[PDB]
Design a protein around this ligand. Structure first.
Ligand SMILES: O=C(CN1C(=O)C2(CCN(C(=O)c3ccc4[nH]ncc4n3)CC2)c2c(Br)cccc21)NCC(F)(F)F
Ligand SMILES: [Cl-]
Ligand SMILES: [Cl-]
Ligand SMILES: [Cl-]
Ligand SMILES: [Cl-]
Length: 289
């Protein structure tokens, strides 16, 4: 219940610039003194990522950061960001996690093509299975992510995946969010129809977003969901799911995706939230395959 020693965090480079803070890549000085679940290979650099709140950030930003610490303090799964430690008794407030050396999954995967930098079909399924495993864990906690997408996943060594949540402000992904003055920013292309129409976010809407995330993976992250349709058309499509007159449209089957796997995606996009498969089944399907 004690702070990680802030003085042992040695800056190396900036990983991200946020509205109210920054994420740094740091080395941990003399880490064997602290093992704090640090995974140290003797005499090698222990690299960590540190999310830091600017000390002069607004009171509201500090309040939101303190709530994030509370949420993050519960998350203990190999496929979700895990806290190695925090520095919160004094400023700047910080949260420390393992460094994932290959960055976000969208940028990582889009450099690859399906093997004839390549990636095999079984490896794509292994990536997707890890995401499903992380979401399965969140579901056991009754924790709704609300923004699952490949841009919010991180890649480490050997295609290991962890689910994160960068928020909605990065310029690189601005086109993935729908902005209206005075409203929440919304990842409409990943959202179940009931999220769009009623603002109802649940584990079942996380399953829908998982279907879209799986589609992205099988597209090698080289296409945006519903990419030829306008934001207005995507919102209109949510209405068609509600109306249930056969005019709703779905993401198409990726070239890399067999029909059986596409049918799993379609189950994730069931109109009725209760008919969507649970993450325990999605993981089993993908891990067997
Ligand atoms: O994970 C979170 C929220 N959260 C993040 O998103 C990040 C990690 C990713 N990030 C980065 O800037 C970045 C970029 C390249 C990187 N390489 N290696 C690490 C790394 N980080 C944003 C900040 C973070 C840290 Br750090 C500490 C504590 C929480 C978080 N929430 C859990 C759930 F909701 F999703 F389940
Ligand atoms: Cl710091
Ligand atoms: Cl863990
Ligand atoms: Cl390809
Ligand atoms: Cl591979």
């Amino acid at each position: 219940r004690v702070d990680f020693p802030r003085s042992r965090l040695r800056f190396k480079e900036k990983l991200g610039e946020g509205q109210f803070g920054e994420v740094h890549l740091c080395e941990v000085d003399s880490p064997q003194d602290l093992v704090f679940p640090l995974n140290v290979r003797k005499g090698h650099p222990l690299l960590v990522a540190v999310k830091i709140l600017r000390p002069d950030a607004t009171k509201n930003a500090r309040n939101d950061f303190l709530k994030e610490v509370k949420i993050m303090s519960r998350l203990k799964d190999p496929n979700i960001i895990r806290l190695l430690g925090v520095c919160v008794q004094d400023d700047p407030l910080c949260m420390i996690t393992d460094y994932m050396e290959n960055g976000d999954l969208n940028q990582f995967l889009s450099a690859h093509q399906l093997e004839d930098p390549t990636i095999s079909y079984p490896m794509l399924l292994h990536v997707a299975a890890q995401i499903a495993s992380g979401m399965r864990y969140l579901a056991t906690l009754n924790f709704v992510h609300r923004d699952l997408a490949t841009r919010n996943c991180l890649v480490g060594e050997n295609f290991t995946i962890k689910i994160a949540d960068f928020g909605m402000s990065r310029n690189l992904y601005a086109g993935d969010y729908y902005r209206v003055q005075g409203r929440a920013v919304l990842p409409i292309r990943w959202m179940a129809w009931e999220c769009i129409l009623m603002g109802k976010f649940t584990t079942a809407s996380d399953v829908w977003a998982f279907g879209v995330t799986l589609w992205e993976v099988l597209m090698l992250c080289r296409a945006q969901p519903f990419g030829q349709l306008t934001d207005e058309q995507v919102i209109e499509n949510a209405g068609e799911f509600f109306r249930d007159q056969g005019r709703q449209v779905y993401l198409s089957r990726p070239p890399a995706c067999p029909q059986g796997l596409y049918e799993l995606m379609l189950r994730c996009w069931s109109r009725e939230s209760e008919q969507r498969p649970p993450f325990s089944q999605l993981h089993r399907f993908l891990a067997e395959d």
